[PDB]
């Protein structure tokens, strides 16, 4: 679920970058917002299996 | 004292803990060297750098 | 115990290199001093750890 929120929270930074402009760093946050989303994902993953295997 | 007839039939037995789970710990693959031993690597580590 | 030695007579290298200044060789045994006792006492766990075992 964190995993879905960071890319939801991604996608508003593009959304905001297209518009504001000059900002530059809100083309960045996107970028940390997805890398982490992707990286909370296998912790779930991870998580996910070595629950079952219990 | 006097018996009758078995009623019953019966032997010795074996009860057993059955199932055992024993998963895995999640920090296991620091278990064939010792905690000592990891300790003592970061102080090595430390002392040739 | 040489440990404790040893960062003594670092101590007093940092001390002395206040007053003796310009001899710059007393902070080198200082460093020194320190690295050494540092050494001493690997081995002196070392040695704690294997002998109670």
Redesign the interface.
């Known amino acids: 679920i964190l995993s879905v929120i960071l890319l939801f929270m991604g996608g508003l930074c593009i959304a905001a970058s297209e518009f504001y402009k000059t900002r530059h760093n809100i083309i960045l946050s996107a970028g940390i917002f997805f890398v982490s989303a992707g990286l909370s994902n296998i912790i779930g993953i991870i998580v996910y299996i070595?629950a079952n295997?219990? | 004292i006097d018996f009758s007839k078995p009623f019953m039939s019966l032997g010795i037995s074996i009860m057993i803990k059955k199932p055992q789970?024993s998963?895995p710990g999640?920090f296991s693959f620091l278990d064939p060297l010792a905690y000592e031993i990891w300790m003592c690597i970061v102080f090595a580590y430390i002392g040739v750098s």
């Open positions: 070595s295997a219990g | 789970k998963k999640v």
